[PDB]
Amino acid sequence: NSVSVDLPGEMKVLVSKEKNKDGKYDLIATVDKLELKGTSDKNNGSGVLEGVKADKSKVKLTISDDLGQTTLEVFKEDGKTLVSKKVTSKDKSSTEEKFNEKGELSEKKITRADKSSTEEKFNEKGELSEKKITRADKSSTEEKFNEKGELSEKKITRADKSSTEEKFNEKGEVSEKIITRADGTRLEYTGIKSDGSGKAKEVLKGYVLEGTLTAEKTTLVVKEGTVTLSKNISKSGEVSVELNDTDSSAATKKTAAWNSGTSTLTITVNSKKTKDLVFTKENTITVQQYDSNGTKLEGSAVEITKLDEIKNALK
Numbered sequence: 285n286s287v288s289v290d291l292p293g294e295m296k297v298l299v300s301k302e303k304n305k306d307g308k309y310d311l312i313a314t315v316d317k318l319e320l321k322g323t324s325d326k327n328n329g330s331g332v333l334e335g336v337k338a339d340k341s342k343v344k345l346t347i348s349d350d351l352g353q354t355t356l357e358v359f360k361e362d363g364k365t366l367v368s369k370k371v372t373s374k375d376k377s378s379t380e381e382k383f384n385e386k387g388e389l390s391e392k393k394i395t396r397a398d399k400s401s402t403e404e405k406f407n408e409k410g411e412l413s414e415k416k417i418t419r420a421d422k423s424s425t426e427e428k429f430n431e432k433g434e435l436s437e438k439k440i441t442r443a444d445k446s447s448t449e450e451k452f453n454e455k456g457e458v459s460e461k462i463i464t465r466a467d468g469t470r471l472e473y474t475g476i477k478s479d480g481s482g483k484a485k486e487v488l489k490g491y492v493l494e495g496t497l498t499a500e501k502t503t504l505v506v507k508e509g510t511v512t513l514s515k516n517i518s519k520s521g522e523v524s525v526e527l528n529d530t531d532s533s534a535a536t537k538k539t540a541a542w543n544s545g546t547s548t549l550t551i552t553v554n555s556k557k558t559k560d561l562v563f564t565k566e567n568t569i570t571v572q573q574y575d576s577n578g579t580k581l582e583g584s585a586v587e588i589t590k591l592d593e594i595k596n597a598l599k
Contacts, residue, residue, distance in 0.1 A: 286312075289329030291347060292354045293372040297329045313345065315356065320345050341367065384408075407431070469567045471517070473497050486515075488567060491591040506591070508598040511538055515563070523563060525549040527598075538598070552578070560585075561597065571597050 286298040291313075300310040308323040311333050320343060324331030330351055335343040340361040347354050352374045358367045365387060371379045375397045382391035388410055395401045398420045405413040411433065416426040421443045428437040434456065441447040444466040451460040457478065463471035469488050476482035480499025485492055493515060495504035502517035510531040516524040527540035527549065540551045549561040556578035562570045562585060570585040588594055 286310075287327075287329075289351070291329070291351065292374045292376075293356070293370075293378075295354070297333070297347065299324075299327055299329045301327075315343070315345060318343055465567060467566050471502075473502075488569075490589040491594075493591075506594050506598070508595040511598040513594065513598055523547060525561070525563060527551065559597065569594065 320333035320335040322333035493504040572585040
Protein backbone atom coordinates (compact mmCIF):
# COMPACT_ATOMS: atom_id res chain seq x y z
CA ASN A 285 0.00 0.00 0.00
CA SER A 286 2.83 2.47 0.86
CA VAL A 287 6.57 3.02 0.61
CA SER A 288 8.72 4.41 3.46
CA VAL A 289 11.12 7.33 3.01
CA ASP A 290 13.93 8.68 5.25
CA LEU A 291 13.97 12.49 5.82
CA PRO A 292 16.51 15.02 7.23
CA GLY A 293 15.16 15.27 10.75
CA GLU A 294 15.66 11.71 11.96
CA MET A 295 12.03 11.48 10.67
CA LYS A 296 10.35 9.37 7.99
CA VAL A 297 7.40 9.77 5.65
CA LEU A 298 5.17 7.07 4.16
CA VAL A 299 3.98 7.55 0.60
CA SER A 300 1.21 5.64 -1.21
CA LYS A 301 2.18 3.52 -4.23
CA GLU A 302 -1.22 4.23 -5.78
CA LYS A 303 -2.78 7.55 -6.72
CA ASN A 304 -5.91 8.54 -4.78
CA LYS A 305 -9.48 9.67 -5.69
CA ASP A 306 -8.09 13.07 -6.87
CA GLY A 307 -5.07 11.80 -8.90
CA LYS A 308 -2.62 12.55 -6.00
CA TYR A 309 -0.34 10.50 -3.68
CA ASP A 310 -1.25 10.26 0.05
CA LEU A 311 1.45 11.18 2.59
CA ILE A 312 1.59 10.39 6.29
CA ALA A 313 4.22 11.00 8.95
CA THR A 314 4.26 11.08 12.72
CA VAL A 315 6.19 13.83 14.41
CA ASP A 316 6.21 14.03 18.19
CA LYS A 317 3.13 11.87 18.70
CA LEU A 318 1.33 13.97 16.10
CA GLU A 319 0.20 12.35 12.85
CA LEU A 320 0.59 14.80 9.98
CA LYS A 321 -1.22 14.13 6.70
CA GLY A 322 -1.03 15.45 3.13
CA THR A 323 -1.04 14.71 -0.57
CA SER A 324 1.44 15.41 -3.40
CA ASP A 325 1.35 15.25 -7.17
CA LYS A 326 4.75 13.46 -6.64
CA ASN A 327 5.64 10.11 -5.07
CA ASN A 328 9.27 10.56 -3.83
CA GLY A 329 7.97 11.60 -0.36
CA SER A 330 8.26 15.37 -0.82
CA GLY A 331 5.39 17.74 -0.15
CA VAL A 332 3.47 19.22 2.76
CA LEU A 333 1.74 17.45 5.62
CA GLU A 334 -0.43 19.08 8.16
CA GLY A 335 -1.90 18.39 11.56
CA VAL A 336 -3.61 19.90 14.58
CA LYS A 337 -2.49 19.22 18.17
CA ALA A 338 -5.03 18.66 21.00
CA ASP A 339 -4.67 22.38 22.13
CA LYS A 340 -5.55 23.49 18.53
CA SER A 341 -2.12 24.65 17.30
CA LYS A 342 -1.45 23.84 13.64
CA VAL A 343 1.57 21.91 12.49
CA LYS A 344 2.85 22.00 8.89
CA LEU A 345 5.80 19.91 7.58
CA THR A 346 7.26 20.90 4.21
CA ILE A 347 9.67 18.44 2.63
CA SER A 348 11.78 19.83 -0.25
CA ASP A 349 11.49 18.23 -3.73
CA ASP A 350 14.96 16.76 -3.43
CA LEU A 351 14.36 15.54 0.11
CA GLY A 352 17.52 17.24 1.36
CA GLN A 353 15.66 19.68 3.63
CA THR A 354 12.53 19.80 5.94
CA THR A 355 10.70 22.74 7.49
CA LEU A 356 8.47 22.13 10.50
CA GLU A 357 6.27 25.08 11.43
CA VAL A 358 3.98 25.36 14.40
CA PHE A 359 1.24 27.98 14.16
CA LYS A 360 -1.43 29.03 16.67
CA GLU A 361 -5.09 28.05 16.10
CA ASP A 362 -5.53 30.78 13.43
CA GLY A 363 -2.97 28.96 11.30
CA LYS A 364 -1.28 32.31 10.59
CA THR A 365 0.64 33.33 13.72
CA LEU A 366 3.98 31.40 13.75
CA VAL A 367 5.06 29.98 17.09
CA SER A 368 8.12 28.01 16.05
CA LYS A 369 10.06 27.02 12.91
CA LYS A 370 12.67 24.35 12.63
CA VAL A 371 14.64 23.88 9.33
CA THR A 372 16.74 20.72 9.01
CA SER A 373 19.26 19.53 6.34
CA LYS A 374 20.32 15.99 5.55
CA ASP A 375 23.90 16.68 6.84
CA LYS A 376 22.14 17.09 10.21
CA SER A 377 22.66 20.80 10.73
CA SER A 378 19.65 22.90 11.69
CA THR A 379 17.93 26.13 12.64
CA GLU A 380 15.15 26.63 15.21
CA GLU A 381 13.28 29.81 15.74
CA LYS A 382 10.62 30.59 18.32
CA PHE A 383 8.41 33.63 18.09
CA ASN A 384 6.29 35.68 20.50
CA GLU A 385 2.58 36.68 20.24
CA LYS A 386 3.59 39.81 18.28
CA GLY A 387 5.61 37.53 15.95
CA GLU A 388 9.10 38.78 16.80
CA LEU A 389 12.00 36.37 17.03
CA SER A 390 12.38 35.55 20.72
CA GLU A 391 14.66 32.45 20.58
CA LYS A 392 17.01 31.20 17.80
CA LYS A 393 19.20 28.11 17.80
CA ILE A 394 21.73 26.96 15.15
CA THR A 395 22.90 23.34 15.37
CA ARG A 396 26.00 22.29 13.40
CA ALA A 397 26.59 18.90 11.76
CA ASP A 398 28.94 18.09 14.72
CA LYS A 399 26.15 18.80 17.29
CA SER A 400 27.90 21.99 18.48
CA SER A 401 25.41 24.85 18.69
CA THR A 402 24.79 28.54 19.29
CA GLU A 403 21.68 29.66 21.17
CA GLU A 404 20.43 33.22 21.48
CA LYS A 405 17.46 34.79 23.33
CA PHE A 406 16.26 38.31 22.64
CA ASN A 407 14.48 40.69 25.01
CA GLU A 408 11.34 42.64 24.08
CA LYS A 409 13.32 45.38 22.33
CA GLY A 410 14.58 42.51 20.15
CA GLU A 411 18.03 42.90 21.77
CA LEU A 412 20.37 40.10 22.92
CA SER A 413 19.49 38.75 26.36
CA GLU A 414 21.56 35.58 26.57
CA LYS A 415 23.90 33.63 24.27
CA LYS A 416 25.28 30.16 24.67
CA ILE A 417 27.82 28.40 22.51
CA THR A 418 28.22 24.68 23.09
CA ARG A 419 31.33 23.11 21.60
CA ALA A 420 31.84 19.83 19.75
CA ASP A 421 33.12 18.08 22.88
CA LYS A 422 30.87 19.17 25.73
CA SER A 423 32.49 22.51 26.56
CA SER A 424 30.23 25.56 26.70
CA THR A 425 30.41 29.32 27.22
CA GLU A 426 27.38 31.36 28.13
CA GLU A 427 26.62 35.05 28.63
CA LYS A 428 23.78 37.17 30.01
CA PHE A 429 23.25 40.84 29.28
CA ASN A 430 21.09 43.40 31.13
CA GLU A 431 18.57 46.03 29.86
CA LYS A 432 21.56 48.35 29.25
CA GLY A 433 23.27 45.94 26.80
CA GLU A 434 26.06 45.09 29.28
CA LEU A 435 27.41 41.67 30.29
CA SER A 436 25.98 40.77 33.72
CA GLU A 437 27.10 37.11 33.95
CA LYS A 438 29.50 34.71 32.12
CA LYS A 439 29.96 30.97 32.71
CA ILE A 440 32.74 28.86 31.20
CA THR A 441 31.78 25.20 31.59
CA ARG A 442 34.41 22.62 30.49
CA ALA A 443 34.54 19.09 29.02
CA ASP A 444 35.31 17.64 32.49
CA LYS A 445 32.18 19.35 33.90
CA SER A 446 34.31 22.01 35.72
CA SER A 447 33.06 25.62 35.53
CA THR A 448 33.79 29.23 36.38
CA GLU A 449 30.83 31.55 36.78
CA GLU A 450 31.27 35.35 37.11
CA LYS A 451 28.86 38.18 37.92
CA PHE A 452 29.73 41.76 36.95
CA ASN A 453 28.98 45.20 38.44
CA GLU A 454 28.71 48.70 36.89
CA LYS A 455 32.41 49.10 36.16
CA GLY A 456 32.23 45.68 34.50
CA GLU A 457 34.49 44.13 37.14
CA VAL A 458 33.88 40.76 38.81
CA SER A 459 31.78 41.15 42.03
CA GLU A 460 31.03 37.41 42.45
CA LYS A 461 32.89 34.36 41.18
CA ILE A 462 31.93 30.68 41.58
CA ILE A 463 34.40 27.92 40.75
CA THR A 464 33.09 24.36 40.43
CA ARG A 465 35.38 21.39 39.98
CA ALA A 466 34.75 18.15 38.09
CA ASP A 467 33.93 16.48 41.45
CA GLY A 468 31.01 18.89 42.19
CA THR A 469 32.73 20.77 45.03
CA ARG A 470 32.74 24.59 44.81
CA LEU A 471 34.83 27.66 45.50
CA GLU A 472 32.63 30.69 46.14
CA TYR A 473 33.86 34.28 46.18
CA THR A 474 31.36 37.04 47.12
CA GLY A 475 31.63 40.80 47.76
CA ILE A 476 34.75 41.13 45.64
CA LYS A 477 36.06 44.71 45.72
CA SER A 478 38.53 46.55 43.42
CA ASP A 479 41.58 45.83 45.69
CA GLY A 480 40.86 42.06 45.67
CA SER A 481 39.19 41.59 49.07
CA GLY A 482 35.98 39.55 49.33
CA LYS A 483 34.41 36.68 51.29
CA ALA A 484 35.53 33.12 50.46
CA LYS A 485 33.67 29.85 51.02
CA GLU A 486 34.64 26.35 49.96
CA VAL A 487 31.60 24.03 49.72
CA LEU A 488 32.49 20.39 50.29
CA LYS A 489 30.58 17.11 50.72
CA GLY A 490 28.94 17.47 54.16
CA TYR A 491 30.50 20.76 55.24
CA VAL A 492 31.65 24.24 54.24
CA LEU A 493 34.93 26.02 55.03
CA GLU A 494 34.84 29.83 55.31
CA GLY A 495 37.44 32.56 55.01
CA THR A 496 38.68 35.52 52.97
CA LEU A 497 39.96 36.42 49.52
CA THR A 498 42.70 38.98 49.36
CA ALA A 499 44.73 39.97 46.32
CA GLU A 500 47.46 37.80 47.88
CA LYS A 501 45.37 34.62 48.04
CA THR A 502 42.43 32.67 49.57
CA THR A 503 42.48 31.66 53.22
CA LEU A 504 39.93 29.31 54.74
CA VAL A 505 40.03 29.05 58.53
CA VAL A 506 38.98 26.39 61.05
CA LYS A 507 39.30 27.26 64.79
CA GLU A 508 39.12 24.96 67.83
CA GLY A 509 40.03 26.65 71.12
CA THR A 510 43.71 27.67 70.96
CA VAL A 511 44.21 26.03 67.51
CA THR A 512 43.71 27.61 64.07
CA LEU A 513 43.89 25.50 60.89
CA SER A 514 44.28 27.60 57.71
CA LYS A 515 43.80 26.21 54.18
CA ASN A 516 45.47 28.58 51.63
CA ILE A 517 44.70 28.63 47.88
CA SER A 518 47.38 30.60 45.97
CA LYS A 519 47.00 32.64 42.76
CA SER A 520 48.36 29.55 40.92
CA GLY A 521 45.58 27.43 42.52
CA GLU A 522 47.94 25.26 44.63
CA VAL A 523 46.86 24.17 48.13
CA SER A 524 48.86 24.74 51.33
CA VAL A 525 47.69 23.89 54.87
CA GLU A 526 48.94 25.61 58.01
CA LEU A 527 48.43 25.11 61.80
CA ASN A 528 48.74 27.73 64.58
CA ASP A 529 48.35 27.02 68.33
CA THR A 530 48.17 29.99 70.74
CA ASP A 531 49.19 27.43 73.38
CA SER A 532 52.59 27.61 75.08
CA SER A 533 52.68 24.45 77.24
CA ALA A 534 54.82 21.66 75.74
CA ALA A 535 53.13 18.44 76.83
CA THR A 536 50.00 19.71 74.95
CA LYS A 537 50.88 22.21 72.15
CA LYS A 538 50.21 21.25 68.50
CA THR A 539 52.59 21.87 65.63
CA ALA A 540 52.36 20.69 62.02
CA ALA A 541 54.26 20.15 58.76
CA TRP A 542 52.81 20.39 55.23
CA ASN A 543 54.12 18.06 52.49
CA SER A 544 53.11 19.55 49.14
CA GLY A 545 54.13 16.44 47.14
CA THR A 546 51.62 14.29 49.08
CA SER A 547 49.12 17.06 50.03
CA THR A 548 49.38 15.88 53.68
CA LEU A 549 49.44 17.82 56.98
CA THR A 550 51.19 15.85 59.76
CA ILE A 551 50.57 17.06 63.33
CA THR A 552 53.12 16.55 66.09
CA VAL A 553 52.42 16.75 69.80
CA ASN A 554 55.35 16.56 72.25
CA SER A 555 57.97 15.59 69.58
CA LYS A 556 55.85 12.59 68.38
CA LYS A 557 53.77 12.50 65.16
CA THR A 558 50.08 12.00 66.19
CA LYS A 559 48.07 11.92 62.92
CA ASP A 560 48.06 12.71 59.20
CA LEU A 561 45.46 14.97 57.56
CA VAL A 562 45.23 14.19 53.86
CA PHE A 563 43.45 16.69 51.53
CA THR A 564 42.57 14.62 48.55
CA LYS A 565 42.38 15.11 44.78
CA GLU A 566 38.66 14.42 45.29
CA ASN A 567 38.79 17.50 47.58
CA THR A 568 37.86 15.56 50.73
CA ILE A 569 39.95 15.58 53.95
CA THR A 570 40.97 12.25 55.63
CA VAL A 571 42.59 11.51 59.08
CA GLN A 572 44.84 8.59 60.11
CA GLN A 573 46.69 7.88 63.37
CA TYR A 574 50.32 6.94 63.99
CA ASP A 575 51.75 4.16 66.19
CA SER A 576 53.18 4.71 69.69
CA ASN A 577 56.61 5.90 68.55
CA GLY A 578 55.21 8.15 65.77
CA THR A 579 57.18 6.35 63.06
CA LYS A 580 54.35 4.76 61.05
CA LEU A 581 50.65 5.25 60.24
CA GLU A 582 48.17 2.54 61.24
CA GLY A 583 44.68 1.26 60.54
CA SER A 584 42.93 3.02 57.68
CA ALA A 585 42.41 6.68 56.80
CA VAL A 586 38.90 7.96 57.75
CA GLU A 587 37.07 10.53 55.59
CA ILE A 588 35.96 13.72 57.39
CA THR A 589 32.19 14.16 56.71
CA LYS A 590 31.36 17.09 59.00
CA LEU A 591 33.15 20.25 60.14
CA ASP A 592 32.76 19.34 63.79
CA GLU A 593 35.04 16.38 62.97
CA ILE A 594 37.87 18.62 61.74
CA LYS A 595 37.63 20.54 65.06
CA ASN A 596 37.88 17.32 67.13
CA ALA A 597 41.03 16.35 65.17
CA LEU A 598 42.52 19.72 66.32
CA LYS A 599 41.84 19.13 70.06
